[PDB]
Amino acid sequence: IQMENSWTISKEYHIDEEVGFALPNPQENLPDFYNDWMFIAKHLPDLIESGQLRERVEKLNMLSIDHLTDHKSQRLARLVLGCITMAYVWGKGHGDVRKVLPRNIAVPYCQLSKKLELPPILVYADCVLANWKKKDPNKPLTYENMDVLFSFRDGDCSKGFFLVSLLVEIAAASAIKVIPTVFKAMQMQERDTLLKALLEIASCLEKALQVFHQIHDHVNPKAFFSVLRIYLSGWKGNPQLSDGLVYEGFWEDPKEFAGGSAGQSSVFQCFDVLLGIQAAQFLQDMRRYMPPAHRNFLCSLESNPSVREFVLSKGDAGLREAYDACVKALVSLRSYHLQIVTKYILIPASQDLMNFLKTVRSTTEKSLL
Numbered sequence: 001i002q003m004e005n006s007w008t009i010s011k012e013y014h015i016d017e018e019v020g021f022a023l024p025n026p027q028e029n030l031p032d033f034y035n036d037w038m039f040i041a042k043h044l045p046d047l048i049e050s051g052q053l054r055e056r057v058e059k060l061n062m063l064s065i066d067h068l069t070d071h072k073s074q075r076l077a078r079l080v081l082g083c084i085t086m087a088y089v090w091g092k093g094h095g096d097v098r099k100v101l102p103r104n105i106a107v108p109y110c111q112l113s114k115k116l117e118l119p120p121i122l123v124y125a126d127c128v129l130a131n132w133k134k135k136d137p138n139k140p141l142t143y144e145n146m147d148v149l150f151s152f153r154d155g156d157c158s159k160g161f162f163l164v165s166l167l168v169e170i171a172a173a174s175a176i177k178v179i180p181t182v183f184k185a186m187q188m189q190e191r192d193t194l195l196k197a198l199l200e201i202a203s204c205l206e207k208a209l210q211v212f213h214q215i216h217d218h219v220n221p222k223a224f225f226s227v228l229r230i231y232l233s234g235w236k237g238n239p240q241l242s243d244g245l246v247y248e249g250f251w252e253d254p255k256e257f258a259g260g261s262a263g264q265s266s267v268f269q270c271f272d273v274l275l276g277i278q279a280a281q282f283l284q285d286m287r288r289y290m291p292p293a294h295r296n297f298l299c300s301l302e303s304n305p306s307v308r309e310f311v312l313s314k315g316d317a318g319l320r321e322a323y324d325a326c327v328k329a330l331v332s333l334r335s336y337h338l339q340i341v342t343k344y345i346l347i348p349a350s351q352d353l354m355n356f357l358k359t360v361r362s363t364t365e366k367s368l369l
């Protein structure tokens with residue numbers, strides 16, 4: 001782990017001191033040059049509902065990305081074009097799919113994705129980590145004080161789903177700043193320092209689970225399953241787009257990319273790595289849907305000495321308990337997630353993700369010392 005100074009990790013990892021892997025204070029407006037993109041993105045609910053979306057997209061002029069001159073404007077553009085792309089491909093979600101993304105959006109979207117080293121599909125870092133604003137800049141980051149920037153359909157519960165996910169990410173990321181202390185304490189054989197750091201990590205993971213509970217208040221299972229999940233769906237292994245999507249004017253052949261998926265959150269991969277919990281091929285591939293600087297942090301973490309090995313070599317009840325408090329918090333999170341998928345996907349579908357989630361939960365449980 002590269003350090004900015006004796007206390008803080010390098011700014012090159014683009015991890016914020018307050019919101020972690022989330023984008024700090026995302027841009028809400030693009031340069032005037034891109035007004036036509038912003039109009040479509042801001043009106044996706046009424047444009048999809050009225051069947052006007054695809055014709056509006058097909059009438060767009062091709063706009064150069066050269067006027068997106070900084071990271072935040074580029075991230076906002078990616079979010080805008082990603083949401084338009086999912087709306088264009090899936091339409092109203094009844095099977096009337098489009099297999100070709102028109103060049104007037106495919107080319108700038110793919111060029112921008114190339115510049116940020118992200119796939120040209122909507123990812124977690126777009127629709128959660130960059131898709132938010134504070135209502136009152138002087139009040140804290142709570143659901144009541146926040147909004148999303150874009151939604152897909154009225155009633156899709158995108159605000160509830162995206163913001164609760166974001167607040168879970170922010171709660172858990174509070175422990176990232178303790179990570180340099182973990183490794184310093186191991187190198188200096190500071191038992192009490194390591195114990196207290198692990199307890200702080202456990203506390204943050206426990207808080208993150210309490211925040212996730214808010215999902216029930218702001219997301220209804222039927223709306224999530226039947227509507228929102230449509231626009232998070234990708235074109236990898238998808239029988240409706242079995243060869244992928246044609247990005248007109250960028251590649252001649254169709255290309256497959258996964259939609260929103262488990263494993264795209266950097267902060268939970270980070271504590272899986274830190275605690276040695278590290279299905280596996282799927283999670284490795286999902287790192288490539290993460291911003292590249294966040295991948296680099298995960299990779300630097302994997303190159304550090306093993307916390308788990310340190311705790312094992314010691315034979316120290318307090319360290320075992322503090323380590324297990326972190327693992328137990330992850331077990332509780334994954335058990336809760338299994339119940340969420342049951343309520344929000346399985347039961348609605350009744351009226352493979354689970355075997356995957358059971359495998360991860362079992363791996364986590366088997367890491368208890």
Ligand SMILES: CCOC(=O)C1=CC[C@](C(=O)OC)(c2cc3ccccc3n2C)N(S(=O)(=O)c2ccc(C)cc2)[C@@H]1C(=O)OC(C)(C)C
Nearest residue numbers: 123124165168169212260261262263264265333336337344
């Ligand atoms: C109602 C369905 O609820 C979920 O299944 C998720 C909700 C949140 C989240 C996430 O980031 O939370 C930290 C996620 C939302 C989201 C949106 C777009 C793209 C990626 C996203 N991800 C990863 N995750 S989660 O990390 O694994 C997680 C889950 C539970 C707990 C207790 C902790 C962590 C999953 C998830 O995969 O959503 C998908 C498949 C993409 C539905």
